[PDB]
């Protein structure tokens, strides 16, 4: 599909280029108030993110009106406003960080390979990156991951041409195994651990909220349904329709940054600014739950 990238040209791209819907301003405000109630009211909240949450940073999505697959399907080159290294976390990224700090977010499941959740400061132990991360390479022998500052340079679980530097438990001489990228190609198996954690988080969630995914790729796209299957609610935030629209308790057609901005105001939380790449391996001890938010005027 990406020719020098060496990825499979046999992929089903799914449904590309559906038109975007925008809920009218009055209906948006009402729906976002309803989301805020649901966040507050709910104990276990899981977010599911896709490419739609990095469009504001200048990274294209896959199946939107100017998505990478959409353009390929109609014979055009994709367009990218920024590089992966120089992309900046959005308000949505930064909002999710704050929601995690205050205990309003149990787990975050993402299909994005852009590295922006990690670089935003979001704790890695509350994050499943189900399709990989451009910045993360992994040792074939011992499974040790390396988070880098620049993209590792291959895709499709290929060798990056660097070796493992871990000194072993008994002997403490270098492992030397082959480091590979973590970017899944079409029909590669997902990461065992990350999927299991995402699945368990999703099963036991009482609210799943999807942001900026069309939910066409499995198993990622079906994880938000497991929530509904055990009595939970499902909120879908997306400009295009999604594959699972019919199962949503609440559906919001608007820009995701707007929704998250309004969501945080209703909860009385500030969205932090971003200092720069800050890899956080373990979640900091929880901030106290904020004071009860005020009801709709």
């Amino acid at each position: 599909v990406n020719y020098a990238a060496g990825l499979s040209p046999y992929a089903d791209k799914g449904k590309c280029g559906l038109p975007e819907i925008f809920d009218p301003p009055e209906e948006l405000e009402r729906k976002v108030w309803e989301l805020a109630r649901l966040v507050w009211q709910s104990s276990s909240v899981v977010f599911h993110t896709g490419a739609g949450i990095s469009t504001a940073s200048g990274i294209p999505d896959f199946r939107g009106p100017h998505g990478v697959w959409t353009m390929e399907e109609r014979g055009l080159a994709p367009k990218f406003d920024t590089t992966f290294e120089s992309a900046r976390p959005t308000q949505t990224h930064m909002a999710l960080v704050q929601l995690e700090r205050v205990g309003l977010l149990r787990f975050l499941v993402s299909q994005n390979v852009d590295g922006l959740h990690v670089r935003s400061g979001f704790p890695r132990d509350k994050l499943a990156e189900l399709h990989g991360n451009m910045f993360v390479e992994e040792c074939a022998k011992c499974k040790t991951q390396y988070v880098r500052d620049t993209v590792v340079g291959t895709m499709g679980l290929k060798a990056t041409g660097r070796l493992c530097t871990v000194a072993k438990a008994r002997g403490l001489r270098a492992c030397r195994g082959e480091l590979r990228d973590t970017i899944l190609d079409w029909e590669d198996s997902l990461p065992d651990r990350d999927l299991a954690l995402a699945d368990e988080a999703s099963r036991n969630a009482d609210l799943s909220i999807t942001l900026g995914t069309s939910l066409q790729i499995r198993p990622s796209g079906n994880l938000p349904l497991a929530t509904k299957r055990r009595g939970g609610r499902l909120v879908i935030v997306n400009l295009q329709p999604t594959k699972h629209d019919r199962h949503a308790d609440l559906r919001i057609h608007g820009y995701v940054d707007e929704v998250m901005t309004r969501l945080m105001k209703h909860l009385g939380l500030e969205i932090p600014a971003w200092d720069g790449p800050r890899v956080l391996e373990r979640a900091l001890p929880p901030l106290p739950r904020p004071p009860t938010p005020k009801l709709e005027p």
Binding site: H131, D185, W186, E187, S189, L190, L195, I217, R218
Partner: peptide
């Protein structure tokens, strides 16, 4: 081990 696809 579950695979990344559209599944249909």
């Amino acid at each position: 081990t579950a695979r990344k696809s559209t599944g249909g």
